[PDB]
Amino acid sequence: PSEKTFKQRRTFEQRVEDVRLIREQHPTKIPVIIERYKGEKQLPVLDKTKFLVPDHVNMSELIKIIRRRLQLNANQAFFLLVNGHSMVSVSTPISEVYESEKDEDGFLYMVYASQETFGMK
């Protein structure tokens, strides 16, 4: 069993409209859904789901932001997977990840998992 994901809580049509509106309001920011990997139980759940990221940052910067928001220990390793099993290079600009890996609804989906969870998998 797993809690409903964002896609299971919000219809495709609702999601498409969310993004249409937010691209008009914040056209220099990428709309991102950040969720805990299915079955990851070590790392905490984020308080929020829908985020906006300035479109000039690279993946390394976003990873830093997420680690900080999750309040991880510095030596707690994790993985960020997009669209949502694909690895990304930390040097990749977020606008490049967006345009290559965005969902059909216009969100970029990401999940995070621990090195432990990732390792035994």
Can you give a write-up of this model?
- With 121 residues, the protein is α+β, with helices and mostly antiparallel strands.
- It has a single domain, classed as Roll (Ubiquitin-like (UB roll)), CATH 3.10.20.
- Helices cover 36% and strands 21% of the residues.
- The protein has 5 helices and 4 strands.
- It has a 4-stranded mixed β-sheet.
- The protein is globular, with a radius of gyration of 14 Å.
- The two termini are 18 Å apart.
- A lipid is attached at residue 119 (Phosphatidylserine amidated glycine).
- This is Microtubule-associated protein 1 light chain 3 beta.
Keywords:
monomer; 121 residues; alpha+beta; Ubiquitin-like (UB roll); 5 helices; 36% helix; 21% strand; apoptosis inhibitor/apoptosis; LC3; Nucleus; Zinc
Architecture blueprint of SSEs:
Layout: H1 6-9, H2 12-25, E1 29-36, E2 50-54, H3 59-70, E3 78-82, H4 94-101, E4 108-114, H5 115-120
Parallel strand pairs: 1-4
Antiparallel strand pairs: 1-2, 3-4
Protein name: Microtubule-associated protein 1 light chain 3 beta
Keywords: Autophagy, Cytoplasm, Cytoplasmic vesicle, Cytoskeleton, Lipoprotein, Membrane, Microtubule, Mitochondrion, Phosphoprotein, Ubl conjugation, Ubl conjugation pathway
Main location: membrane
